[PDB]
Symmetry: C3
């Protein structure tokens, strides 16, 4: 008599049991977030670039011939544009070296042009301090970006015993004072991908083993300010194939020997430009010929402009399994003060005007809670499934012992 | 003999079993946080407002009569305040149209005043680019806030095939150059909720289907800078009644057909002002009469000033079950450079002074890890409880088989 | 016959069972993150400091004698440095009170010097508003930092019924307008830890019961801007000994009666300076003698400079079990506008130049989602282990009933 709903007690097992086994096959994960004060923490690499690509005093006669149009300094008939914009003192200088009567074109490449005309760390870096220790231009590695000759502090390449951070605050990080040298900025007479309307620098904080994409990803620092950048290192760990679609951390993709989102982007930005312009830009890796100024203006610029703005399809990247993110909070105070302008003016052999317009202090450091791990953890292991459907079996063929008793 | 602590083995079951069943009734939840590089991602809406509400050249004789006191331009006896502050060239203009001898008041409402005197996108927008494509004032929807005539890029209303983002960097987002038109700013002679001491604009990044609250929630952008806004879309999902107290996402509340915190706030800001001033402000929805300048100064301003600063009680909102947050990291570089000022001066038919004081470049884009889900997941399902108290029952009436054996 | 792999079915139990018991001993935890719109939320404390330590008009003859070298105003032979930098009008004033012929040294201590020469809230605070209510210098508590005489709004010490926040937006928070008084800045003739090249203020948002470390942790606010600081309170809860190594929240460590990272840092910064200079700095607690200017320059500065930049070893802190973090997003607009400069100039009895160079508006408020809890939760309780190894036992000595049946 009392056994009709005992096979109905089998119906309860089925419904409850069949969902815990479906839940496993969804392969669900939870998140383990730990914000903590670390010790012996590795300091990131800091890349920076002047927003002006070429120093006006270094642009030679041959430099202007090959690259003039690309820099919007010459029209098509190799002369100064009909318009343009002043300048009483500069137009004298430029038209003198725009005189091509007497001139025969000499060999030219953009990498050497960037390298020589590009702004120099040795005259930009007025002051460097990391953790009490004073750094020099030696502590900065030259790296080429779409901006030109750029510089990486703490690149930590070749034997260099990487710099560590212990606690929070400005003192436990990097401080640099810079002269952006506005009096060396190329006159802007038109708009091209090489000229800008802005004075200042671009900065990007990244892992030593991930290349910069400062054109796209970087932050700006304005001249005539001290800028505080309070940071936090975020370690993001993901789960392999069955739970999430991450690509393996330890390589292995193309021109760089560490897989990251940025490396993957530059990888096929190189492929794309080679497969379309027969040409690579200055900042791209590989061994293809460097783009000639004519190829930059006709092919290489629009090609990369297409990839970084229009493309929805060609250069897309998978998620790596390890990602380092840098949370940052920015802040400014004015430099110089009325009470200090004259000091710095004298100290660096400069006008008081100049100091207010060119001088810049950068502070990169971490806050107290400097380290964050965001790791995806498995929610239902195989053993926990068996221990749940097992203890589910012995509940309707094991806890029936107390219902038939009553 | 060996059965005295077997009912003491029942005591172990009770203590361990009664806490796993209490743990279920706490209804606990965990968090699933996923920061990832997305694809086919929806671009937010961008609302912006000039901090000056009314263009000085558009304030007519009738405009000054009705709204003069509210704008701190006239005292109570309809004349220019006894003090005030200059200006040799402006006081000539204002006192000419402050001459009310010969004048008879004409019909007036604030919405039309805002609409006509309000700053115009067509003369503010000097440059617009989204993802390589150039935008025009057509791509901006006019929206009224407490600031006045404001504008929303990518409002995505009425058929408009919403704009998408693929990757990280400035190129995959919006860039706009603006003239805030300081020479059109109303003279500030006193302090009111309509005048400000600041030049610049207010910006707010929000969902297409959530209204702006830019007065309260927005960020500022200063003139004479290029400002980079690196973003991250954060999707926050919460749990319904038993686990958390969220209100349903899909409606359904009052003047807007999507429930959000901002919509809920404006909802009863409208109710409150109607139920206290017999009046609605220009930016509020519904069908009540628009506030007259006199009602603004006497009733509507203090009423809303009470709600947004003092009120602890009247207009409080429940959490929605879906929230879109935008993490943002701001950055500046100077505009113009010494080497480009003259170009832009000529390009827009303006003084070099003007360019340094009025011109502004805004960049809104997402970083590489553009998308974040913060979803609350159930920690103890009903099936996992049964599989644990079941496997708990068969441990003291099932693993006694190995203790009586020894 | 059908019993050879039944002891092989014992092998399955062993492998699956021995990992769920190893998983427990790893003591794993998950994370519960809840971003929500709060109510009745406690407003933080806001500390700020002028970047100039000593007001030029308050530096007396005796002040210059004792502290002159430390301030880089005097060389070693008690005279004005041979160089230095101007100033036609200031060098007249300073050399008059640098005349020590006729002068006999009087008693001196840095705390009184900071207290008297330090910038005064009563002449810096031009405007204060919190949630519609106007605040005065009374609402600001004087606190000494390495900057000098600094000020804390909403310190909430001694009976003060702490201020609350309800919703998001500028209105539900603090707004302050400041004159940093650049015309009162001490001339900078050299570089010391007491002089700076920057005009502006340092700000830090912290818990009422945690001291400031504004030198290290604070953010800057530049003069001639309105700065918006959109905030979010983050409550971080950690797990005691067995799961994580947190130190107890409710005390109990040294000079402050609440354990926090900042309190712990100042604790042994005090110990260190006492145990090395026989000396404490002005901002440090305890009862040791205050450092004399000579001791500052010779001992106390380099000692603390060592701790905040070089030290990897001496002053390291454990994690507390409760931490309050403040996420912040910064933003600027220009002050004053061309149309308002003259008003403020007149209002505060100042030059139009002065207003552009000294005036500053600060806005501290929370966004809509103002409150965040990041709490570490236990992943495998003891009861859930037993209910899993129990339901694991009764799966190979309980679900064999269906395999021997077939
Ligand atoms: Cl790409
Ligand atoms: Cl409200
Ligand atoms: Cl320390
Ligand atoms: Cs450009
Ligand atoms: Cs490789
Ligand atoms: Cs206002
Ligand atoms: Cs509705
Ligand atoms: Cs200093
Ligand atoms: Cs204590
Ligand atoms: Cs379980
Ligand atoms: Cs279980």
């Amino acid at each position: 008599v009392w056994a009709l709903c005992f096979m109905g007690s089998l119906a309860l097992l089925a419904l409850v049991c069949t969902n815990r086994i479906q839940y496993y096959f969804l392969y669900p994960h939870v998140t383990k977030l730990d914000e903590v004060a670390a010790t012996r923490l590795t300091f990131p690499a800091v890349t920076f670039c002047n927003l002006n690509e070429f120093r006006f005093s270094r642009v030679t006669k041959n430099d202007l011939y090959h690259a003039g149009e690309l820099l919007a300094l010459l029209n098509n008939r190799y002369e100064i544009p009909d318009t343009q914009t002043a300048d009483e003192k500069q137009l004298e200088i430029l038209q003198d070296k725009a005189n091509f009567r007497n001139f025969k074109p000499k060999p030219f490449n953009m990498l050497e042009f960037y390298d020589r005309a590009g702004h120099d760390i040795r005259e930009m870096l007025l002051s460097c301090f990391f953790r009490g220790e004073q750094c020099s231009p030696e502590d900065f590695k030259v790296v080429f970006t779409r901006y030109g000759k750029c510089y990486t502090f703490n690149a930590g390449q070749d034997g260099k015993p990487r710099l560590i951070t212990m606690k929070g605050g400005t003192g436990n990080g990097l401080e640099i004072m810079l002269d952006i040298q506005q009096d060396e900025y190329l006159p802007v007479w038109g708009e091209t991908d090489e000229t800008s309307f802005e004075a200042g620098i671009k900065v990007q904080i990244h892992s030593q083993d991930e290349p910069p994409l400062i054109d796209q990803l970087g932050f700006g620092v304005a001249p005539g300010f001290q800028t505080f950048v309070s940071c936090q290192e975020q370690r993001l760990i993901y789960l392999p194939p069955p739970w999430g679609d991450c690509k393996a951390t330890t390589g292995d993709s193309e021109f760089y020997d560490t897989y990251s989102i940025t490396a993957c982007r530059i990888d096929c930005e190189t492929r794309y430009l080679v497969e379309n312009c027969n040409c690579r830009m200055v900042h791209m890796p590989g061994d293809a010929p460097y783009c000639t100024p004519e190829q930059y203006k006709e092919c290489a610029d629009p090609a990369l402009d297409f990839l970084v703005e229009k493309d929805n399809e060609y250069c897309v990247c998978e998620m790596p399994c390890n990602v380092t993110r840098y949370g940052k909070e920015l802040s400014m105070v004015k430099i110089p003060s009325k009470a200090s302008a004259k000091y710095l003016a004298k100290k660096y052999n400069k006008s008081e005007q100049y100091i207010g317009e060119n001088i810049l202090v950068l502070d990169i450091f971490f806050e107290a809670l400097n380290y964050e791990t965001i790791e995806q953890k498995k929610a239902y292991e195989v053993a926990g499934l068996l221990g749940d459907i097992g203890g589910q079996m012995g509940l309707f063929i094991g806890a029936s012992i107390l219902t038939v008793l009553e």
